[PDB]
C-alpha cells in the first residue's frame, strides 16, 4: 500500500465507500 | 484518527472502510 | 459557481472544511 | 442532501460549509 494523505485520502474514501459516503475527521 | 492511521502510518482497505458511514 | 459532483464535491469539502473535516452522505 | 444541493443544483460556500463537522 501507500501512505494516503489529504486529498488522496479523501478520494480513496470516496471511491471505497461509494453510495454509503463517509466521515473525514482530522484530530 | 484516520490521518494517524492512513497518512502518518499505512492503512489497508479494512481500516479505510471503518470511516464509511 | 459550478455544479460540484463526485470527487470534485469531496475535494471542495476537503478544502473548505480544513481541520474540521466533513461528512459526505449521498442519499 | 449534499448531492441534491451541490451536484444536481448549484450550491454556494454557505451551503457547502453546512457539511463540515
Author numbering:
A (entry chain B), C (entry chain B): 3 to 29
B (entry chain A), D (entry chain A): 1 to 21
Q: What do the authors report?
A:
Elimination plasma half-life of ~20 h in dogs and ~70 h in man is achieved by a strong albumin binding, and by lowering the insulin receptor affinity 500-fold to slow down receptor mediated clearance. The crystal structures of these low-affinity insulin analogues were determined to assess the effect of the substitutions and addition of albumin binders. The crystal structures of OI338 and OI320 shows a conserved insulin structure with small differences compared to the human insulin backbone, with root mean square deviations of 0.37 Å (OI338, 44C(alpha), Cα atoms) and 0.56 Å (OI320, 41 Cα atoms).
Two amino acid substitutions (A14 Tyr→Glu and B25 Phe→His, named OI106) were sufficient to stabilize the insulin molecule, with an optional additional deletion of B27Thr (named OI189) conferring further stability. The strong binding of these two representative insulin analogues, OI338 and OI320, to albumin ensures that the majority of the molecules in circulation are bound to albumin. The pharmacokinetic profile for OI338 after oral dosing was characterised by a rapid absorption period, leading to a steep increase in plasma concentration and reaching an early Tmax which resembles the IV pharmacokinetic profile. A multiple dose study wherein OI338 was dosed daily orally to dogs for 14 days demonstrates that accumulation to a steady-state exposure occurs after 5 days. In people with type 2 diabetes, orally administered OI338 had an elimination plasma half-life of 70 h at pharmacokinetic steady state and a relative bio-efficacy of 1.7% compared to SC administered insulin glargine, with no additional risk of hypoglycaemia.
